[PDB]
Write a protein that binds this ligand. Structure first.
Ligand SMILES: CC(C)OCCn1c(=S)[nH]c(=O)c2[nH]ccc21
Length: 167
């Protein structure tokens, strides 16, 4: 048993809820929250800007030191950093950004990072401002992630679109 509440069960291991990922992290304090990161860990908008804002910019300060030491992530890659006040850890995962022209086939590689963690609170990757189709992102998630994933999909309209169409 875990602390996640109000989720619809899609599969053996994938759950979904109409909830903002920041408010969910603050309530649950999960072991792992996933950030929808870019390769530079520049948290400006979407999930990254909201999580960083909720950490009072401590996520960005930590991320800038990570990049200064290690250089940029790969598209499809990840790193584990602090979860600050939101979670034990933040798994920063880079899905392909369609609005920058990246290979959508890299979305499966992105989701494979989740399999290194037994339980995660996560957005969809590559949807919203990243330019891909969220229905596709949910299908790749279900067909790639084997660990237990709780998908916090921001508002009613995106929640309603994903559930009704789910195969
Ligand atoms: C940044 C990209 C991946 O956004 C996807 C949509 N998204 C989702 S799925 N859950 C949230 O909680 C959330 N907050 C802001 C955006 C957002």
């Amino acid at each position: 048993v875990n602390s996640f509440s109000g989720y619809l069960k899609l599969t053996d291991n994938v759950y979904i809820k109409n909830a903002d990922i920041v408010e969910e992290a603050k309530k649950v304090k999960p072991t792992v929250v996933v950030n929808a990161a870019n390769v530079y860990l520049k948290h400006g908008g979407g999930v990254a800007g909201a999580l960083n804002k909720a950490t009072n910019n401590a996520m960005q300060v930590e991320s800038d030191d990570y990049i200064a030491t290690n250089g940029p992530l790969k598209v499809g890659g990840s790193c584990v950093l602090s979860g600050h006040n939101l979670a034990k850890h933040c798994l920063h995962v880079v899905g392909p950004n369609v609005n920058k022209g990246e290979d959508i086939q890299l979305l499966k590689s992105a989701y494979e990072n989740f399999n290194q963690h037994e339980v995660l609170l996560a957005p969809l990757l590559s949807a919203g401002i990243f330019g891909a189709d969220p229905i596709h992102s949910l299908r790749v998630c279900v067909d790639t992630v084997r660990t237990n994933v709780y998908l916090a999909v921001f508002d009613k309209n995106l929640y309603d679109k994903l559930v009704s169409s789910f195969l």
